[PDB]
Each structure stands twice: as C-alpha cells, then as structure tokens.
C-alpha cells in the first residue's frame, strides 16, 4: 500500500498516494469533483476524480459498480481507458471514498468544429476513429447512449478517443433547446423503443454532418419540434416500418403527421464528397434494424485511405448479469471494493 496525504481543495478533502503531484481542481459534476495532477510514476498528467456519494443508494451503489466495471474492461486506441483506481481506507469497513485516475484529455471535437477550417481528410479521419473504437464497443456488447462533440476527445496530431459512456441523464437535462438531446435517435428520444446498439450509429451520422456543414443537423427547440426536424430530412415512416412499430404512443401520434418523403442528400450537403453523402444516408435511417453497423461501416470505400482489417480489434467478452441482479447497498459495495483491490494497471 501506498503512502497517502491529505490537503483541502475548494473545500473538498483529496487524500491520495504521493505519486499524484501538483493537484489543480479543474471542474465540478453531480457525480464527483476533478483534479489535474502529475503523475509521478509514469510521467503523465492525469485527471484524478473523486466519486461524490458513491454509496448513498441502491441506485447510486450500483451506479459505481457499473462505472467501475466499464472502465476497467475498455482496452482501445480509441476509447478512455482506466490509468488506476484507489481508495485510502485500509479495509472493506472503513470504505467510503473510491478514485479513478486517467489520461488528462485537453480540446473535444465541439472546440475543433467550431473553430478550425475541416478538409474532407479530416472528416474521414475523424469518422474513422469513431467507428473503430465503436466497433470495439459493441463488440463487448456495450452501447455507449450518449456520443456528442463534446465526448469526444481530440489531439493536436487529429487523434481521437471516446469518452463520458451513459450511465443512465434526468428529464430536465433533456428539455428544450440543448445539445443533450440533438444527437439522439428518434425511437428513443420519446422512449419508443429499449435501447440497442443501433441509436449510437444515429449520433455518428449527426456528427459526421456537423464536420461537413459547421452546424448542428437537428437543432430542435424541444422533442417535438426534433422530431419533425428528423422526419422533414429522412421522410415520414414507411409501411413496412409502421408494421413494426410495437408502441401504441408512437403510432397514434405518427398518423398525425402529413406524409413526407426522404430529400435529396446532395442537394442538402452541397459540395460534399459524394462518397460521404452515400455513408450519411446509411446511417440516418429511421428504421433501425436497416442502418449500417459499425464494422459495416469501415469497409465503405469513404475509408479506403485508412481502413485496415488486420488493425480494427474486437473487445474481450464482458459479463453484464450483474445489471438484472438485486443486491442490498452494503453488497454493491462489497462488489465495487473487490474491483479497486484487484485492478492491475496497463503495461
Ligand atoms: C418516427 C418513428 C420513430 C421510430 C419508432 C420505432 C422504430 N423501430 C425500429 C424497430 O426501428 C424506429 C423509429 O424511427
Ligand atoms: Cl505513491
Ligand atoms: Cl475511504
Ligand atoms: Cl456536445
Ligand atoms: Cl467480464
Ligand atoms: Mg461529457
């Protein structure tokens, strides 16, 4: 066991292992609180947060395990991973307080959209590496429910990591005109359907529009207005997938609507590849079972440049049981201190 020292830091105390120097508080959740230090042992600056009321509930205690558990399994050039995890207490009855430590990441993809001029090699890029971590996620069995800009990380060298996985957002949080809800696919953004691998494929065809326009694709000023945004561009539902739709909600209020077809891609991306054009109608689709996967999606010839089959790797397998499990607080907790006493740090 490492040797700890305590100081006070915006009126938070922070007690780690020495090798962590030079702590500066650089942002503030509802989930915990955020330092950048210097790592000492391996010469990185990291971002160190510490967990805000990890055990305060069931909810909450099985929310840390989850946490836990996701970033000690995502091992990818392109997605965060886990540098260390500790907590100072000496045994399982004075644990409170839980750690995690990782890469201090600078600019999101919304600083470079907003202000950098992107080549068409750029946006390749870019989609490219969304994709191949994505691949490598849903692999894994994993749906990350919440890519947007400002989730992802990029360098100065265009490189770009996946961060910020949906833990299961409030209501409020999604209200109105914001960005929490625009990347969103529209079978879930009213709760139409369960959640499955296919919403997160919608969230790339939204980026990827962003990086050839400059500007948000569906900017709604609330659900509603979202939502016909989205059917304005890819048309109304089409017989076949109104067979589908199981939710009596979604049904009664669609045949509401006036019937509108798909528009025309090229006239709405003017002056873009024609090759991304194709790629963008693959992905905004509104039936899900029809849109491009991710390993689908590497193999378009948009990618020729960079796609590499011997170089686009698969996740180990990852035991989510515990996710229909019922367990008392104390026992999430047992859960979550064996996984910090057990975690072996990368090479
Ligand atoms: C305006 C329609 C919203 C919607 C509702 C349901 C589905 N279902 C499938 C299987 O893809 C897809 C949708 O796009
Ligand atoms: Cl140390
Ligand atoms: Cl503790
Ligand atoms: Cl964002
Ligand atoms: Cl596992
Ligand atoms: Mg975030």
């Given at each position: 066991?490492?040797?700890?020292?305590?100081?006070?830091?915006?009126?938070?105390?922070?007690?780690?292992?020495?090798?962590?120097?030079?702590?500066?508080?650089?942002?503030?959740?509802?989930?915990?609180?955020?330092?950048?230090?210097?790592?000492?042992?391996?010469?990185?600056?990291?971002?160190?947060?510490?967990?805000?009321?990890?055990?305060?509930?069931?909810?909450?205690?099985?929310?840390?395990?989850?946490?836990?558990?996701?970033?000690?399994?995502?091992?990818?050039?392109?997605?965060?991973?886990?540098?260390?995890?500790?907590?100072?207490?000496?045994?399982?009855?004075?644990?409170?307080?839980?750690?995690?430590?990782?890469?201090?990441?600078?600019?999101?993809?919304?600083?470079?959209?907003?202000?950098?001029?992107?080549?068409?090699?750029?946006?390749?890029?870019?989609?490219?590496?969304?994709?191949?971590?994505?691949?490598?996620?849903?692999?894994?069995?994993?749906?990350?429910?919440?890519?947007?800009?400002?989730?992802?990380?990029?360098?100065?060298?265009?490189?770009?990591?996946?961060?910020?996985?949906?833990?299961?957002?409030?209501?409020?949080?999604?209200?109105?005109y914001?960005?929490?809800r625009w990347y969103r696919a529209p079978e879930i953004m009213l709760n139409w359907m369960?959640?499955?691998?296919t919403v997160?494929i919608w969230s790339?065809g939204c980026?990827?529009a962003?990086?050839?326009?400059?500007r948000t694709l569906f900017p709604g000023t609330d659900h509603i207005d979202q939502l016909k945004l989205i059917l304005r561009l890819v048309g109304t539902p089409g017989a076949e997938l109104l067979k589908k739709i199981?939710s009596?909600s979604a049904r009664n209020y669609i045949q509401s609507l006036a019937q509108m077809p798909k528009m025309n891609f090229?006239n709405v991306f003017?002056?873009?590849?024609?090759?991304?054009?194709?790629?963008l109608e693959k992905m905004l689709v509104l039936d899900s079972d029809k849109r491009?996967?991710?390993?689908?999606?590497?193999?378009?010839?948009?990618?020729?440049?960079?796609?590499?089959?011997?170089?686009?790797?698969?996740?180990?397998?990852?035991?989510?049981?515990?996710?229909?499990?019922?367990?008392?607080?104390?026992?999430?907790?047992?859960?979550?201190?064996?996984?910090?006493?057990?975690?072996?740090?990368?090479?």
């Open positions: 066991r490492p040797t700890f020292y305590r100081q006070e830091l915006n009126k938070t105390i922070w007690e780690v292992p020495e090798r962590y120097q030079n702590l500066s508080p650089v942002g503030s959740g509802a989930y915990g609180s955020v330092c950048a230090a210097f790592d000492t042992k391996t010469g990185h600056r990291v971002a160190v947060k510490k967990l805000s009321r990890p055990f305060q509930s069931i909810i909450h205690a099985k929310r840390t395990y989850r946490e836990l558990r996701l970033l000690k399994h995502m091992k990818h050039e392109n997605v965060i991973g886990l540098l260390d995890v500790f907590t100072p207490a000496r045994s399982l009855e004075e644990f409170n307080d839980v750690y995690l430590v990782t890469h201090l990441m600078g600019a999101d993809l919304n600083n470079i959209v907003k202000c950098q001029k992107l080549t068409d090699d750029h946006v390749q890029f870019l989609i490219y590496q969304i994709l191949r971590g994505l691949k490598y996620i849903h692999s894994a069995d994993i749906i990350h429910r919440d890519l947007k800009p400002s989730n992802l990380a990029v360098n100065e060298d265009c490189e770009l990591k996946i961060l910020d996985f949906g833990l299961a957002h409030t209501d409020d949080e999604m209200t109105g914001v960005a929490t369960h959640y499955n691998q997160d790339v980026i990827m962003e990086l050839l326009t400059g199981s009596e090229a003017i002056g873009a590849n024609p090759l991304a054009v194709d790629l491009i996967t991710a390993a689908q999606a590497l193999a378009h010839a948009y990618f020729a440049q960079y796609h590499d089959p011997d170089d686009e790797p698969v996740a180990d397998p990852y035991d989510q049981s515990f996710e229909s499990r019922d367990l008392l607080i104390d026992e999430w907790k047992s859960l979550t201190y064996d996984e910090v006493i057990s975690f072996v740090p990368p090479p």
